[PDB]
């Protein structure tokens, strides 16, 4: 497939590590779709070169530049910087359908069946289940949709200061319409849910397709012992992330 | 309506306080349906008399008695005591459709529109969103269904040691089938979600129809100052519970 793709995002080198591990995991599980990543000029050359290898397409977005359509909204609402860059995922009209995935997610199995879904499909967010988690979602690139989202961001902002509030407000039929737009929780398993509802994780966790390290601490914020091959019910996943980073990404950064 | 009813449960005097406040809140918001409560012999006479006043029907269930259909399963799986008593809600065949509600819930607005739903309708559980929270659900009394649930409880038990695991396993199409069986989160707003996703609560919390004090600490475990009329983003709801308990239930317990 050349007109469908997984799309991730990174505005710095820290999250680029996540994007590289994510991209590697998608290749590892033999995706037949394209891989694209939105980056900013703040991503260093070393990381960019690595990204050029793992991803089929590397797009550069600079909302700090007056030439960007989102620049004005950025001046007005500074807290939406990351959100505004993220919204450019809808500008990738070279693709007919895409699956946006946070840079802090990890794929455990082929998830190409997500392309069977329609915009806007996403998994329920723990905490407030009638809102979908914007870390993983199926959408359709469109300049019109992009302009509409940018307009809402400018006009009213986001109820949670991030893209999730904005997207839930725009795609507000999600909770009460079309069960097919509710992606199973295993396509965006928030690593925190392993504590909140451990019994559920024990019963269904083994079916996890995508792990999302939602929260303050990211995989790259841990120390990993290459000897014992473990970071210093959440480790199992963190160790998979590090096994991939250690085995595939680090050597790649060294060219 | 005489063949439809809200059904709650209490095995002791502590939860009877909750059942009385819940029942009062349903009357306060002018429900046109019947009110029923499952009780056990452990509920004292004082509480029972109060329950006989607030509820249209008080049913007594004693799984500790060999004559009860669930007794044997209780001997085999002791951790399911409360669950087995709860399952008797399906034995109330005098009603064609019911809304089960935990004794630790509180109604903030008329919710008779829930009777438009079909079994099994329930709200998403925070923590693991692909499981429904069993604190509030629409079901259809049936001896066959009761027997089927009892059989599963005996044969395999519950993945979480309580009724929620059992019910989710039995009604396992919930997460992927019929969006109408997904009751809006405001029909079972877990008081904890006020912390997890505060932004969401600020944006939609005002629409809460049912508050659920899910967790270790219940309303009756707090001290309430009748002078300042406040317990000693969660108080607002706890104070409503206590206003009702203080204003309507306490005087009732005094006859
Ligand atoms: O400096 C930054 C911060 C974020 N990102 C990108 O933005 C995504 C979202 O940010 P992240 O740090 O992963 O946020 P979360 O821990 O996943 O959480 C936030 O984002 C979730 C989904 O986007 C919501 O469910 C939460 O409420 C919100 O707090 C990341 O994966 C990256 O792709 C960057 O590129 N650079
Ligand atoms: O000694 C007891 C304990 C419970 N109950 C009844 O059982 C209901 C369920 O128990 P509760 O104490 O309210 O449990 P929760 O705090 O709501 O939580 C549990 O029950 C929820 C829904 O039933 C699940 O979402 C949770 O995972 C589970 O931990 C209560 O409302 C009562 O009606 C009694 O009558 N007597
Ligand atoms: Mn994330
Ligand atoms: Mn409860």
Curated annotation (Swiss-Prot), chains A, B:
Biochemical pathway: Glycan biosynthesis; glycogen biosynthesis
Keywords, comma-separated and alphabetical: Acetylation, Cytoplasm, Glycogen biosynthesis, Glycoprotein, Manganese, Metal-binding, Nucleus, Phosphoprotein, Transferase
Annotated coiled-coil segments of the chain: none
Organism: Oryctolagus cuniculus (Rabbit)
Necessary cofactors: Mn(2+)
Binding-site list for UDP-alpha-D-glucose: 9, 11-12, 15, 77, 86, 102-104, 133-134, 160, 163-164, 215, 218
Modified residues (N-acetylthreonine): 2
Main enzyme class: transferase
Effect of residue 83 to S: No effect on autoglucosylation
EC number: 2.4.1.186
One cellular component term from this protein's GO annotations in UniProt: nucleus
Residues holding Mn(2+): 102, 104, 212
Family, as annotated: Belongs to the glycosyltransferase 8 family. Glycogenin subfamily.
Protein name, entry field: Glycogenin-1
Catalysed transformations (reactions): L-tyrosyl-[glycogenin] + UDP-alpha-D-glucose = alpha-D-glucosyl-L-tyrosyl-[glycogenin] + UDP + H(+); [1,4-alpha-D-glucosyl](n)-L-tyrosyl-[glycogenin] + UDP-alpha-D-glucose = [1,4-alpha-D-glucosyl](n+1)-L-tyrosyl-[glycogenin] + UDP + H(+)
Co-factor binding details: Divalent metal ions. Required for self-glucosylation. Manganese is the most effective.
Role, per record: Glycogenin participates in the glycogen biosynthetic process along with glycogen synthase and glycogen branching enzyme. It catalyzes the formation of a short alpha (1,4)-glucosyl chain covalently attached via a glucose 1-O-tyrosyl linkage to internal tyrosine residues and these chains act as primers for the elongation reaction catalyzed by glycogen synthase.
Site (Important for catalytic activity): 86
Binding-site positions, UDP: 9, 11-12, 15, 77, 102-104, 212, 215, 218
Any one Gene Ontology BP term: glycogen biosynthetic process
Quaternary structure and interacting proteins, as annotated: Part of the GYS1-GYG1 complex, a heterooctamer composed of a tetramer of GYS1 and 2 dimers of GYG1, where each GYS1 protomer binds to one GYG1 subunit (via GYG1 C-terminus); the GYS1 tetramer may dissociate from GYG1 dimers to continue glycogen polymerization on its own. May also form a heterooctamer complex with GYS2 (via GYG1 C-terminus).
Tissue note: Detected in heart, skeletal muscle, brain and testis, and at lower levels in kidney.
Taxonomic lineage from the root: Eukaryota, Metazoa, Chordata, Craniata, Vertebrata
Residues of the full protein shown: 1 to 263 of 333
Principal location: cytoplasm
């Amino acid at each position: 497939m050349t007109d469908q793709a997984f799309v991730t995002l990174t505005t710095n080198d820290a999250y680029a590590k996540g994007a590289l591990v994510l991209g590697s995991s998608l290749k590892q599980h033999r995706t037949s779709r394209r891989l694209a990543v939105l980056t900013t000029p703040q991503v260093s050359d070393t990381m960019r070169k690595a990204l050029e290898i793992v991803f089929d397409e590397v797009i550069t977005v600079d909302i700090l530049d007056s030439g960007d359509s989102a620049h004005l909204t950025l001046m007005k609402r500074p807290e939406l910087g990351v959100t505004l860059t993220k919204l450019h995922c809808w500008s990738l009209t070279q693709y007919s359908k895409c699956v946006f995935m946070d840079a802090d997610t990890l794929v455990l199995a082929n998830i190409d069946d997500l392309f069977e879904r329609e915009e806007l499909s996403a998994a329920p967010d723990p905490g407030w289940p009638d809102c979908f988690n914007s870390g993983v979602f199926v959408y359709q690139p469109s300049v019109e949709t992009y302009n509409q989202l940018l307009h809402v961001a400018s006009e009213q902002g986001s109820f949670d200061g991030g893209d999730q509030g904005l997207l839930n407000t725009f795609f507000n039929s999600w909770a009460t319409t079309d069960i097919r737009k509710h992606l199973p929780f295993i396509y965006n398993l928030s690593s925190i849910s392993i504590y909140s509802y451990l019994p559920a994780f024990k019963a269904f966790g083994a079916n996890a397709k995508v792990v999302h390290f939602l929260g303050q601490t990211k995989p790259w914020n841990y120390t990993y012992d290459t000897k014992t091959k473990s970071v210093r019910t959440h480790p199992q996943f963190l160790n998979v992330w590090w096994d991939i980073f250690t085995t595939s990404v680090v050597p790649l950064l060294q060219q």
